[PDB]
Symmetry: D3
Subunit: 284 residues, 6 copies
């Protein structure tokens, strides 16, 4: 029996449930209750505060959790990062009032406000800089105008929040906010390592599969050799006859980021009825 | 022209609309209005109180409805149950205050509170027990603490509601709450039996299809005979060549409940890029 | 870099975002913010008032927009209508109090209230009729009871709003409300015509694809010739062997509106496990 | 320690809590939890389904409840109606399809649908009429169009629901829906009758007080005798000097329904700065 | 029977209903339905689109309405403004991109976007300036960035919307947005002028009363002459004895804007227990 | 110009705004924006995270804030507590799994989870106990079941959260959660101490006033001496004649907690029409 922590609120909550459903796990009946038991797969899901999930995996009885990479950095927990999940990512920056030409060495001896004080203290220490790091609960950008800090450190999305408070980012970026699957650092026994590997393999099937689309298209046999070079697939394109003996249908996986270039090439050699559909799971 | 009753509220409402959409019927424009007309399919949908749907089908002009099995038991209506739909299911139990070792024969001469008094009276009568059944509108669990009843009878989900009021279930379970497609018990004419059968066949396509996934995978020709035995499909696996002449692609339906065992077997004999995707409709 | 206007509210807003996602464009992170930048595809999306989108495309810097056809008629903007999108459609009618036998020539010299005064004035002028057209902001049906107009002109959905105010429609219908992709009437340069055509082709892939389903079914080789005539596909049916040498699997696109007739024919000649699945994109 | 049932939902819920607050009882912290304990006043409040409150008072351990008069009629409970509360009132009528000249004797042998079957059966029996009364859970007006009943019986607010389904009311009105304070029919002991009377007196202070306004106005001593006859107050007007020796200020309770006529009379005899303010509690 | 138009949505809707309730009119049962009938006071209330209310009063059958002053300016309706209501007020300004030193004469021949085109055209014409005024449905501030206009004209609240789009206001302010009670310009008959005056007098009682507070305080008789000069009241302070013969209690209306200065003066001469309470109605 | 921090969310937010409105300060226009400027009173209000308000007052530029007493204890800020506000109060307890007879000395060397780690560490240190205090973001009660802690420390409301997780409180209570007005520990200048004192006096007027009701009643002159002893008021009862020379009206403040006992005594000596009304402000 495995126990998995899922964010119960915020930007990571819906895509975390979506990726667990695509891996075949029982979805949450309604947002009211806070555990979901999966008797088929032998897993229990707990819906917890996002900033706490790393502590529950690192110090508690949870085998796995989904949370942001910056929250793992800030927590001090000793856990394994098994997979980057492909959502929630955003840079983490220092920032200070615009029009002042701020640089990293200006931070020495200043007051820096953040919701991630352990992350920031470790970053400054590696760069050999000492400063006063002030813990806040959230929404730190207003703290400069209000006189609590000289500068801030926060997740920056597209700069809306920095711009709306006349702040500009500077310095090297810190630990980012991409969603990750984390695992407790342990060994336990043999009959537990197997059950753990099964979950990682299933989540990995979604993480990998979601990078591709299936192309299906009708192709003249005369353009077949060209078509095969344009869509070589993960192993090799599938080729099946049509009723019309001068034609075939071809099936091949293609990366989502390549799809529009690929289709233009196929049209130019005679391909017709080019279909593209989402992949939600693929065990390579 | 057919008339179909759909629950307008509660746990059955969204999955009932979802199953009707997957059968190809026009979905509700917005939750405000309470009828949807489908000119293409020649069907009108009425969104009604769930506890009333069995009476509208049994005594009214509706040909079909979707409702819970326990609500059909409680209604006294004479209707046909054509399909179990695969959602909404939960046990229906007697319960009484914890720590008292309650048994079914303890009910004789007691006061029993329930929102389903006809269901409970028929159940007691079959077991040869007489008691005072008190009709309540809902949320019956608090009625013991408040002195209206000695015991209750209700849908139990996972026991959250029983536990939160210090109640424990006992006795044989009663008529459960699984969602069902019900039909009016009739004959009408010939030109009406045909239109009725068409709807049942389409809903059945969803009920059956939703139990499977399509597996698509690349396989070495040397492991082909093993692969065929692992995924025999509904009739027989589809086999198509790849461009690489030492390989094929195989397509076969597999039950959702078997999928993870199946994939492990395929990987161990050489299969690569194992894809799995939802089936939403299949006419066997 | 292209700029595209999307309705931010109302009946057109969700299906407009859905069609842009199926064409492969980055979906809106949350309904709070009002621009979404797509660095991959090199497009910026602006979420604007629906009644204003035609003016932003016609007079502003936007290359494209999605809006209702009646709003383009009312705006006076000079834009190209490139695609009808297949949603949001509804008739646009004159209406007047029930039980009075109203005809178009009764409008001469009357007061007509509408939220689309330019559309109505142009319609009357073409028919050679003069009247006083009163601009209102919305919900015009109550304006007769309240004495501001003798008749109205409005989008009629199914007549709920007309019926609920005792109004009946008359006369030839006006410019309807179907959703359309509009483009700025221009030429600009060469490197801009190409980027524009790419977007139209991708949206067209969704508009075309969404009219079909993929049928997949197992078929005896003895019924193969009949099967090919029943599902001829967009080019020609795909045919692949099963493991069982007396059988094949057939794949063919079929129009959604034909699907249930088609499947009945296939069952009657021996076809088994008839699958149907949505198409979300097809470049013909 | 007293126990009081308050509707947890619907049209009676907010004004019931408002009247209990004005009587000085602790208000509900938030709509989530379902009991509120008042240690000061020694009362516990339970927030229950409105249709069940009469059964909890009549058969359970609750001393008091607030509910509709029609729900008491339908419940069959033996409880005392102590106060009419002055809100929630509406007529209860039979109704049948418009344009048919329906009368009470037309009900004999017909099918009548209602959410209050015990109320309706008792009403028919008193009039010497037999019919088939069909219990429905709610929203009964659509049941005629759908073929379950020939006529209905329901609370009619202003006829919106009857009109929107082409129904017209007929016959003598039944038990109405005015909110009432009900009490368990009992005697218990001496130390319980006292605590019960205290609550009734406090609620009665609100019910009585809310029928009046306090008038405060400056008046010339020459118009004093006229003023006293216009506002005689509950006992006699209060009269106090102003600094200016030719003037006084007068205070008197006046019924809300009389206030505007009263003020016009006072202005016409010289009164100035006529103030009116709500009364929320008055023990006569 | 009078008919009154109330905004059904937006910033004016709640304070408009609040002022009508304090004048003693029946409040809206729930936001669903769109008329409220007051049989006691013989008035019917219609809840309409705010931008349309001036047209319903000016051209329709409504006797009164509550709307913004700028909406009356933009409508072209001929109505009487009877009372300024004391809420909703905000300036109406031209604005253009920051850092450009814009002045009113820069508008000549430019494109100006606004939701109030008739208001703006009349303002420009009075100043002897010609320009192209572009009607938009709302949210006009983004129209400069998007290339539809050179400048805008809009209600400015505190400049949040101008600042968030890098716009700065210039020129003389236009017709503002303060809420007003408007009346149809007419004469009708005698028995209608009376009913109209009654409503204006009652609303005026709230508009006037809401500018004051009632002060009630205990005062030594030795400081009485000073106290009378500090709070002279609307006519003259009320003076009543306390039980203690060296003391009195004084009651006087004071303007809300003066209250804190007044109380400081009273404390310094010996006044104790200084009470202040809201006035909701006063007929002077 | 003063700056005041108000909680923007949670249980303290609405009563904090209510108490500031009753002191005469401008209320927040809508929950969207996060500052409100009061030009009349010369105060700016900032709506901030509750757990941060003590840091903004202690280290920032804010003169005042409203927050919980436990949050001041946990923050380490050096601020003055000027007033207890009379809402939000609740005990703060240690707790551990039920049925184990837990005592304070059992905490030594254990793991204790809390959202208020500084408060808990200082409490343990004063009692001479060492333990491992684990910071969590919220909802700490589940942390025992999940293996992160042996015991917890949290605000307990009525024990719902402890009971729902099978925890029981033990030991002496810690710093509680009552709402307080806090002030920055400073001196600044002379012209700033005055403006600060004015705000404290106005909030104190609400805190004091809200503990009383005004009684107004008609009394026979023969029962006057008894009446004066029953309601002596804050200074002495107000006495005014009625028109009827055998009667007077009496006005006196009485504590809310005494009111029902007082009224019973007044009725028994002949008092009639006993009115009671809320006090929202009183400067003693
Ligand atoms: N044969 C193609 C498509 C696939 C069929 C089955 C799995 S992948 C490929 O390898 O990409
Ligand atoms: N031939 C495979 C897969 C299918 C293709 C078409 C329908 S089912 C089977 O029977 O399971
Ligand atoms: N060959 C079939 C099905 C398709 C396969 C690939 C594209 S369309 C057809 O043309 O309809
Ligand atoms: N004396 C007046 C007003 C009141 C003063 C106190 C109670 S009622 C009356 O009897 O109406
Ligand atoms: N006599 C005082 C207070 C009032 C008593 C009644 C009306 S106004 C004044 O004129 O202000
Ligand atoms: N004179 C009474 C009532 C009051 C009148 C004015 C202030 S307090 C008292 O001191 O309680």
């Amino acid at each position: 029996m495995l126990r998995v922590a899922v964010p119960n609120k915020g930007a990571l909550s819906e895509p975390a449930t979506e990726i667990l459903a695509e891996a075949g796990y029982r979805r949450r009946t309604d947002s009211k209750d806070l555990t979901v038991i999966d008797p088929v797969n032998n897993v229990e899901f707990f819906f917890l505060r996002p900033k706490d999930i790393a502590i529950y995996v690192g110090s508690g009885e949870l085998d796995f959790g989904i949370t942001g990479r910056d929250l793992v950095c800030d927590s001090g927990a000793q856990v394994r990062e098994r997979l980057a999940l492909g959502f929630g990512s955003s840079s983490f920056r220092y920032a200070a009032p615009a029009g002042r030409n701020w640089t990293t060495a200006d931070l020495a001896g200043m007051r820096i406000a953040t919701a991630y004080p352990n992350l920031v203290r470790k970053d400054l220490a590696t760069k050999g800089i000492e400063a006063t790091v002030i813990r806040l609960d959230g929404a730190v950008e207003i703290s400069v105008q209000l006189g609590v800090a000289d500068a801030i450190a926060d997740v920056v999305g597209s700069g809306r929040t920095l711009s709306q408070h006349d702040l500009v980012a500077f310095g090297e970026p810190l630990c980012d906010s991409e969603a990750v699957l984390i695992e407790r650092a342990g060994t336990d026994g043999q009959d537990q390592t197997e059950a753990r590997d099964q979950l990682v393999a299933r989540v990995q099937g979604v993480v990998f599969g979601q990078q591709y689309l299936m192309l299906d298209y009708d192709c003249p046999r005369s353009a077949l050799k060209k078509a095969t070079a344009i869509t070589p697939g993960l192993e090799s394109p599938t080729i099946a006859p049509l009723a019309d003996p001068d034609w075939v249908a071809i099936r091949a996986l293609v990366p989502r980021r390549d799809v529009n270039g690929i289709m233009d090439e196929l049209a130019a050699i005679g391909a017709k009825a080019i279909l593209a559909s989402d992949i939600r799971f693929c065990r390579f």
